[PDB]
Amino acid sequence: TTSQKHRDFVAEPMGEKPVGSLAGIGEVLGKKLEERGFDKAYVVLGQFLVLKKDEDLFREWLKDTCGANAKQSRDCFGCLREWCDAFL
Amino acid sequence: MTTSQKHRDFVAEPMGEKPVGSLAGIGEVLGKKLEERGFDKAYVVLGQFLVLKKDEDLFREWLKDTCGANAKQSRDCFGCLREWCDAFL
């Protein structure tokens, strides 16, 4: 299943939404992503696209970059994958 | 309109799995060098554009370093991605 946060994200263009609008990215992860330059959701989309939408490599990058656990990286990947299927 | 028809076709619709050569400024020569470096679909180049926070200087330099794009090619590619993002992102 998915959260409402996921459904809200995949339903519309992301524009300049902050990184915290991604499913899985709560306060703590969002801070650490901002510290490393990923301050908006589209920058994380960028990394997902550079990695050619590879689930294992993206989720591993997210863990390495901000400490996302398995649930959090699963949620974040899923919302970017579904967003891309709808809008890219 | 002063943009190319090729820019117009790209920015008119979602890019899906379009190849890198669908981007304005990316002819066959630049497209082959990009593919060889792993940037084989236009969305992978969009990805680099987004990871660079849409910065023109950083992106155009990256494009020069990666495939040897000249100034006009890199401006055209950047402008096509910038307008695509304004339309769809």
Curated annotation (Swiss-Prot), chain B:
Impact after mutating residue 4 to D: 75% cytoplasmic localization
Phosphoserine found at: 4
Gene Ontology CC entries for this record: chromatin; condensed chromosome; cytoplasm; cytosol; nuclear envelope; nucleoplasm; nucleus
Gene Ontology molecular function terms on file: DNA binding; double-stranded DNA binding; identical protein binding; protein homodimerization activity
Phenotypic consequence of residue 4 to E: Complete loss of phosphorylation and mislocalization of EMD in nucleus
Tissue specificity comment: Widely expressed. Expressed in colon, brain, heart, kidney, liver, lung, ovary, pancreas, placenta, prostate, skeletal muscle, small intestine, spleen and testis. Not detected in thymus and peripheral blood leukocytes.
Effect of residue 53 to A: No effect on LEMD3/MAN1 binding. Enhances histone H1/H3 binding
Subunit structure: Homodimer. Heterodimerizes with BANF2. Interacts with ANKLE2/LEM4, leading to decreased phosphorylation by VRK1 and promoting dephosphorylation by protein phosphatase 2A (PP2A). Binds non-specifically to double-stranded DNA, and is found as a hexamer or dodecamer upon DNA binding. Binds to LEM domain-containing nuclear proteins such as LEMD3/MAN1, TMPO/LAP2 and EMD (emerin). Interacts with ANKLE1 (via LEM domain); the interaction may favor BANF1 dimerization. Interacts with CRX and LMNA (lamin-A). Binds linker histone H1.1 and core histones H3. Interacts with LEMD2 (via LEM domain). (Microbial infection) Interacts with HIV-1 pre-integration complex in cytoplasm by binding to viral matrix protein and Gag polyprotein.
Annotated protein name in UniProt: Barrier-to-autointegration factor
Organism the protein comes from: Homo sapiens (Human)
